[PDB]
Design a binder for these strands. Structure first.
Lengths: 128, 259, 220
RNA sequence: AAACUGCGAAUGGCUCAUUAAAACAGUUAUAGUUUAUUUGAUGGUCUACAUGGAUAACCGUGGUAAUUCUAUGGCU
RNA sequence: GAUUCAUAGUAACCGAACGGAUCGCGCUGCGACGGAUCAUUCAAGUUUCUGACCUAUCAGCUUUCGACGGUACUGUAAUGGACUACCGUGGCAGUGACGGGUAACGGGGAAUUAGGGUUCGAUUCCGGAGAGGGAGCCUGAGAAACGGCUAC
């Protein structure tokens, strides 16, 4: 159904190599806006190189529907954006694949066993 | 008990930071030049005044670039107590912030010129003789300038050079000299000094007069001389420390919001 | 019962079980650090002499100087034997055998001083070489006798590993070098400079306060 | 990796049994004192191209029914 | 406000403490670590004044074994009956001492629709105390610590 973009609270941040701003959007008819569709429109507005520099988050639709508003954050380069941004925000976008770590309870059970053995402890890694 | 407390709590924080009630159980805890309740830590400048950072994580990512300086010196600790009349200098953007007291009783980073951001003022706490019989000032900042003039007494300000270590311009503490308040009820108010009472025992107090002829008092610990009788060494914030009235502050605010 | 016989100089050792009572009977009522004759421990052991180092008893440690012929409970300080600290400042009470030897303990550990004519299959036959040569500089000097002016570096010990071509080497601490001698010159420059700055500040101030108080005499 | 050294572990969290000029509250004093750390000062004056010998981990090797028990021997 | 304060000077004393045998990037710059004294900051320990619920079927408490004071040690991070020698005979109480009860941790606060009040506050913050009961102690800037140790 399309939407109308109009940013707010812009703050050029050269220390962090990024631009931060709230987006505000108007969409009569349509139910919400996906971030894959929003990142394409905010790219062509701001004359960006690459979608991977841009990262987007928040987005509540208000009560009633039609209106919505959220946050956004245009870096320069994707490699700077990968460094300073935490990984969970990038992942929703899909730029970076999720990292499969082991569980928190399982990790704790290693180190309490690792306390008990002095010397060479590394047999406990394969054993658990 | 048993030793120093490593946490401070939100709510039990100072009010003049203006950290909110929700969105955290704890608040950042600032020891450095300045006191806990007469300072503001470097995190809540970056996130909750200047709006560069969003999070506590992002302030570490700023400060460990070695972009932030104070007093022409790089401070890597995110919870460094940056207090009254300290300069802050960021090389990217090329903008500098001298922290003054706002008229309401808050910290605010006042933006200043590049030549002005060299110097800063330090009111001397007392003067004292060190070893080899050499004299020495000590400041509110907790610097210790040595070999002053014999001229320089207690309870008065000195323009430091910062680029070099040494002093440049003194000031005296007398009637008809401009004076900001740093603490208590009348904080953020600047006025000429009319008179001081002695009270030989404890707590000297000073009555002094705002530029709209309002008269008000404070203890000498709170009072901080800026400059001469009219004029001032430093640049002042919005309103210049008048503190207009409650009904005036209402009228100006709602007249603004209608646009 | 089970004598643990140690060669120090070769770096070899092997346990032996003791048949009969009578082979143990020289060892009873003896201290640690006593040179006991090891002729009468067995057949092959002939013309030997053994220092006695420690041991453990059925319970399973004895420490020298404790004395007594039975297990005892002691409170241990830092830097005692038979106790690793968990925390700093932690003392702990712990059971321990006497130093003087009796029958009922399990193992004696023994260290030979002078071997006889005959050969032991465990101890005498071989020699395990030392793993690490000396790291720090004057420990290398005292090994081969260098004076000082021979210089270190080339008298390093380097084994090479199996398979892939690679040597490994100690990094000699307290070695005189270009960085180390320069750090004295950089430090001693600051000590020279910081004095003469503070002296000239004092000389400059001396005339300033005299210039001040002379102008105060004009007011009189 | 492991181990030695450094720093932390005296904060935080939980509870209300004690306790009635005690604790606590506001208000002083510390000329009656200790203070890791932070911040700023200071300081040539007593084989100097460099002093000494042991200790882990590690290797060899045991004890005990059993534990965050540990001994003897050889290196750095 | 005030000293025997800071500091300088004189005459000696001791080793039991400082005056860098340390590390990285690059005639020469920058900063990591160590440690002494002096401020500074985060503190902590004592400390002045004033303040509390019921009870008189609790009226006299305290002391030679510190009760109140004095001199001189000792001890402490320092001040002190804090502790030890001698010496004096004081100190508190009818405005409630001393003792008993509390289903009592204190306060910031909470409930209660005139004003004045009455009852509650284990519990978000700030103090306090404790880690089954008592006691003792090491390490350290800081603990009489308990997710540290020793004993009953």
């Amino acid at each position: 159904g399309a939407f109308s973009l109009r940013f707010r609270k812009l703050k050029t941040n050269p220390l962090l190599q990024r631009k931060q701003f709230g987006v505000d959007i108007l969409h009569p008819s349509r139910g919400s806006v996906s971030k894959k569709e929003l990142v394409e429109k905010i790219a062509k507005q701001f004359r960006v190189s690459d979608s991977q520099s841009i990262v987007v988050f928040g987005l509540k639709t208000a009560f009633g529907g039609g209106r919505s508003s959220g946050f956004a954050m245009i870096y320069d380069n994707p490699n700077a954006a990968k460094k300073f941004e935490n990984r969970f925000r990038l992942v929703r976008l899909g730029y970076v694949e999720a990292k499969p770590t082991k569980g928190r309870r399982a990790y704790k059970e290693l180190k309490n066993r690792r306390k008990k053995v002095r010397g060479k402890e590394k047999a406990k890694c394969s054993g658990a | 008990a048993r030793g120093p407390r490593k946490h401070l709590k939100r709510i039990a924080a100072p009010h003049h930071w203006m950290l909110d009630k929700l969105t955290g159980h704890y608040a950042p805890r600032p020891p450095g030049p300045h006191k806990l309740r007469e300072s503001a830590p470097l995190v809540v400048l970056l996130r909750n005044r200047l709006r560069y950072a969003l999070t506590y994580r992002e302030v570490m990512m700023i400060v460990m670039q070695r972009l932030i300086k104070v007093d022409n010196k790089v401070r890597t600790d995110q919870c460094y107590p940056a207090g009254f009349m300290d300069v802050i200098s960021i090389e990217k953007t090329k903008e500098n912030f001298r922290m003054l007291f706002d008229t309401k009783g808050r910290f605010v980073p006042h933006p200043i010129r590049e030549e002005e951001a060299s110097y800063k003022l330090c009111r001397v706490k007392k003067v004292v003789v060190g070893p080899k019989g050499v004299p020495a000032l000590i400041t509110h900042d907790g610097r210790t300038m040595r070999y002053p003039h014999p001229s320089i007494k207690a309870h008065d300000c000195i323009r430091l050079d910062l680029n070099t270590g040494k002093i440049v311009d003194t000031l005296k503490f007398e009637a008809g000299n401009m004076a900001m308040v740093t603490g208590g009820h009348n904080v953020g108010r600047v006025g000429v000094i009319v008179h001081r009472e002695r009270h030989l025992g404890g707590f000297d107090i000073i009555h002094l007069r705002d530029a709209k002829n309002n008269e008000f008092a404070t203890r000498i610990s709170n009072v901080f001389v800026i400059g001469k009788g009219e004029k001032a060494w430093i640049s002042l914030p919005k309103e210049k420390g008048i503190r207009l009235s409650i009904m005036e502050n209402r009228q100006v605010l709602l007249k603004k919001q209608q646009m | 019962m089970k004598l643990n016989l140690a060669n120090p100089q070769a770096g070899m050792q092997k346990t032996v079980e003791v048949d009969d009572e009578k082979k143990l009977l020289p060892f009873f009522e003896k201290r640690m650090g006593a040179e006991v004759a090891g002729d009468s421990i067995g057949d092959e052991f002939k013309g030997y002499i053994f220092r006695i180092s420690g041991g453990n008893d059925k319970q399973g440690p004895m420490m020298q100087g404790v004395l007594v012929n039975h297990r005892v409970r002691l409170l241990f300080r830092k830097g005692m034997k038979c106790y690793r600290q968990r925390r700093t400042g932690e003392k702990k009470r712990k059971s321990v055998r006497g130093s003087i030897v009796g029958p009922d303990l399990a193992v004696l550990n023994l260290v030979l001083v002078k071997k006889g004519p005959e050969t032991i299959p465990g101890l005498t036959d071989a020699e395990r070489p030392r793993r690490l040569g000396p790291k720090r500089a004057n420990n290398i000097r005292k090994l081969f006798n260098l004076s000082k002016d021979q210089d270190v570096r080339k008298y390093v010990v380097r084994r090479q590993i199996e398979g892939k071509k690679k040597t490994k080497a100690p990094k000699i601490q307290r070695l005189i070098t270009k960085t180390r001698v320069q750090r004295k010159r950089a430090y001693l420059a600051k000590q020279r400079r910081s004095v003469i700055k503070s002296r000239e500040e004092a000389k400059a101030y001396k005339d300033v306060l005299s210039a001040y108080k002379h102008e105060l005499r004009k007011k009189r």
